[PDB]
From Swiss-Prot, chain C:
Recorded name of the encoding gene: pyrH
Keyword terms: Allosteric enzyme, ATP-binding, Cytoplasm, Kinase, Nucleotide-binding, Pyrimidine biosynthesis, Transferase
Pathway per the UniProt entry: Pyrimidine metabolism; CTP biosynthesis via de novo pathway; UDP from UMP (UMPK route): step 1/1
Protein name: Uridylate kinase
EC numbers: 2.7.4.22
Database matches in NCBIfam families: pyrH_bact
GO cellular component, one term: cytosol
UniProtKB/Swiss-Prot annotation, chains E, F:
Main location: cytoplasm
Metabolic or biological pathway: Pyrimidine metabolism; CTP biosynthesis via de novo pathway; UDP from UMP (UMPK route): step 1/1
Entry's Gene Ontology cellular component terms: cytosol
Gene name of this polypeptide: pyrH
Record: residues binding ATP: 12-15, 55, 59, 162, 168
Domain of life: Bacteria
Family: Belongs to the UMP kinase family.
Organism in which the protein naturally occurs: Haemophilus influenzae (strain ATCC 51907 / DSM 11121 / KW20 / Rd)
Lineage: Bacteria, Pseudomonadati, Pseudomonadota, Gammaproteobacteria, Pasteurellales
Catalyses which reaction(s): UMP + ATP = UDP + ADP
Protein's recorded name: Uridylate kinase
Keyword Transcription regulation in record: no
Region (Involved in allosteric activation by GTP): 20-25
Functional note: Catalyzes the reversible phosphorylation of UMP to UDP.
Subcellular location: Cytoplasm
Activity regulation field: Allosterically activated by GTP. Inhibited by UTP.
């Protein structure tokens, strides 16, 4: 089909980038993602990307050893910049115009995040990657996806997972309201992230990024994955 | 055995923090290192630490795929900050006073490197960790260690390896001049790092950090590892 | 009596600084607060302060006219820095050692926020003021108070209000658990802030700051205001 | 009537955004100003803007209480940024391409002031707003307007006021030289602002911005308000 | 044996005061002479801040005559004051004086960023504080910087170091002047903006011959050396 | 009439290349001459980046002899390269050439902060990019900066401007050399760290006489002017 969105925010966990060796960055996987993003771009979609850092750092063992959680979150924010640099270089090599922004100033490495400049780049049809989360500890990459998504006036947050969407347990939900997710006690994202998306009416699509082709289907149709959005019984 | 140095710069590869499992940061190894450092501090030694990032990022596979080496070197520099943050926390937990300095300003995470601020912290008997290399690509961690050692006026650069020191390939050399290393075509660090140490007369000790007690033996005596310094034939003192 | 906390985070709305004139900063109110903070400091309590900006900027009218909420939030954050500067100066004039930290780097104006530097200053018995929120839009001053409080290892967040505590609407609750606040759908703070406080077990005291003496009572006893903390039925 | 200027710097006091109620930012007044600026842009005029902060912060009370004046000047500078953010948004809502530059770095909020980047944006026909004064205390918004005007090579500094121009208190003066202002002891800016304008030969127009149509008249002709410039005798 | 009459001073030096007999650069022997004189003030409890000019390293006239933008010329001058500042900081360290350099531009890795209350804290800690890069803005002289910094760090006085004994007709030296006198006799002391800033805040000025070893200690420990300018 | 043999160059100039007959500062006529020559490279489609040294404005020798910390001296030199950068940027503007200045140090309000990919973007837009403040670090010559920047921005060549025609024995001029040859014959071209960087990355070097009007154009449009150093 043709795209149903003008501007998306695609959220990928760091683990999206790992190979069967389940660690670091797999170049073949990253280059596949770059070609998939290229085809949305040549479809005319404005693409922003938020990456986590869990392929490069998981702090559980250090936390168990007594590491301060603030320090663990900082390490993780740095890991997202490293992932963002790799994606930016992968996009360049696929001949896609791309820019990396970071919550922290990183002079000589990338751009500093600025919401109005990001929208300006997106409207220039550059892919914008957001790294370093929000600069603060105790806030998930999901919270960052929702925050950035709302700031850059994206139409939707695409939550890339390793599963087909949201299940009860196994039956896949196609459409859920924010109220239903809460009522049925389902797992979508942490309550803080979900609450930001809800208060601002940002719809979320949860889909399987590991299925080559799934991303294009999400962007061009209603059928792939699970959609979470505002219930019908409020406004018209 | 008392310390023969007042101020040291310890260079560790990121791989020194790595577990036998073969990646990342092993909290037992890291905590073992914090205890060893703590025992240098309680001997009156002023300690600075330069960390690499190869336990967290090896660029080979991405490089062969065509990644720009500038970008690969930025990723590696960010990886050294992550090790520095781990090390600072480890030292804190061992009740060692420690600061992390970064060649990139990182507001809210750590201090921005300044040579005379670092000297001041070292005189106050704080351990200073240096991360993010020199801010620039194409320069090794060994080159960072020599550069920082020169700037903060360390007595020596200690190059922690997984070997007992510098061999033919096998005999271990105890003492070498800068001229000998080049004449015998021995590999000690990269040419730029070595060149910098050489021009400034910075002595280097290559030792096995993996041996417990080795760091203490290196700081309190002449026998452990291989020493590289200026030969006697240029001047008297 | 004697203080029950070692380290507090005191959250004041910008509206706590206002007079009967309905806007701005009232120097007499500000100086009363500074003397009240001085008396905690000389009791040995380490005090950090989070200030809102609502006395200087109310965005509702501009929002009505179409102003982008990101922009409204940025304005509000700048307003907290102005309040923070007024408080720092008021503390100096009451001979209390204080420092202002900001989420944004403001070269020449104040210090850049850094959690471990703030703890070091608190350990030095300096009062640390936190301004510019988290540097991000869509996150309340209550959220900032809980985030900063958790980061600097405060014992409690004191939520200064103009009411006595949390009411059923009226009977004043003395003690509530997090589970109870949600069960009875009471309003304490926004769900984001409350959730952050709840997941880290940060207790909250809601009290009447506009009652002179109530802050010292809160810091030295269990009786003033409403306590919100983890319920007993967990461990 | 057509513009007599290629590039202007419009100096607005914070109190120009103020509602008749007396405080803060009145959206109607603010959006009226954006429409007037848009019509300057639509005539080909390159517009820069300098905003004061006295609608959001007046430090008289805190100062009598003992507040350090450095601290008071920093609060005022931050208030000019808040005004600048509001102005940038209003211009955006009037479909005018506008940028905010601050004398302080404010990562995430706006651009950092750079004189040649500002000239480049003005040549691209973007409205550039300057906030946070010069980053230093003890210097008026008038001094900021003159400094920025000189740096970005404005043709003129327009000083928006609530009066029709400079008076005896009353004759309105039409044209004054710098030497006439000092010789007649008239009050136009503070001495350091006027001195800077004078030394650099920057003309100033003092006019009633509270009169709808006046801004357009000032830019398209010589009659509205009071002009202060270098005398013919040098 | 004479004791200090000031608790906190701001000493303004032109860049030309560090110049050698070869009339240029930085003369190490002049600079080390000044480090010894500043150390003498420190060991008597005087809190010392220093503003340096850049004219020994950059004079803009030739480039300006060729058409160089005055902003650009002022930016080049600001950077030259930082170079002088770094030499002065190093000179003070070699004389065993605790000294810090603050710049109007954040210069990561080189020196501190200027902050008025941090500078006051350092002055109370009995550290010498050097201010460089002026105010960060063009069209403002080093004299305006001296007056502004002096006011901000709450100095008792601004000492304007020169190569002559004080303020003259050109040959009669004045000893005392009011701000009003200076303006009415059209005497040359500093630019109108700088002078007006000192006037409105009641900052007194002392104009003296720093060229003379001895003069600085004399100015700080007595009222007679040089020309004193204060409110009438 | 000869066409360019390079698409993208990095032109290293010593600070001394801008000094006048009187052997100091910045000569506006020399600077404007160089601006005209750069403009003709740009007019032919060559992408031009420029690294500048600081020795016309600061030489550390005397201060170093007196005991100045070499770090501090290297910081002073770096700031001197920005001053040169600012003069060159203004000179190019006056010749009607689009140019940008980038600094290793963030200098808010003065110039751009260095970023490799942003420099490349500007070079593709046919802007001249001047690099100042070196790497930000001490103990690294301007030649090392030239090599490093050249590599980062993917220049075809590093043109080392000098006051002589090429690389000599001391007097025979060499036209062609390998990196091996230079090291074996111990020829003076640049320090070992800079040269080693050029070598390991295969960056060719041209050593020419920028003192001669016309030589820059000859070097960019022909293979015979000066000395060429490349991989054997």
């Amino acid at each position: 089909s043709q795209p149903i969105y003008k501007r998306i925010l695609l959220k990928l966990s760091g683990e999206a980038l790992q190979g069967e060796d389940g660690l670091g960055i797999d170049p073949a996987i990253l280059d596949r993602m770059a070609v998939e993003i290229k085809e949305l771009v040549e479809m005319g979609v404005e693409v922003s990307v938020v990456l986590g850092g869990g392929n490069l750092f998981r702090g559980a063992k250090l936390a168990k050893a007594g590491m301060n959680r603030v320090v663990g979150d900082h390490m993780g924010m740095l890991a997202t910049v490293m992932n963002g640099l790799a994606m930016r270089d992968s996009l360049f090599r696929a001949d896609v115009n791309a820019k990396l922004m970071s919550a922290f100033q990183l002079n000589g490495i990338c751009d500093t995040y600025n919401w109005s400049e990001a929208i300006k780049m997106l409207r220039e049809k550059r892919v914008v990657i957001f790294s370093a989360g929000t600069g603060n500890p105790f806030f998930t990459t999901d919270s960052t996806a929702c925050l950035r998504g709302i700031e850059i006036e994206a139409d939707v947050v695409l939550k890339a997972t390793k599963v087909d969407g949201v299940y009860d347990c196994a039956k896949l939900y196609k459409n859920l309201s924010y109220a239903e997710v809460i009522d049925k006690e389902l797992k979508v994202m942490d309550l803080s992230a979900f609450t930001l998306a809800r208060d601002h009416g940002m719809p979320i699509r949860v889909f399987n990024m590991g299925k080559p082709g799934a991303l294009r289907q999400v962007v061009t149709g209603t059928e792939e994955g699970t959609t979470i959005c505002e219930g019908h019984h409020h406004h018209h």
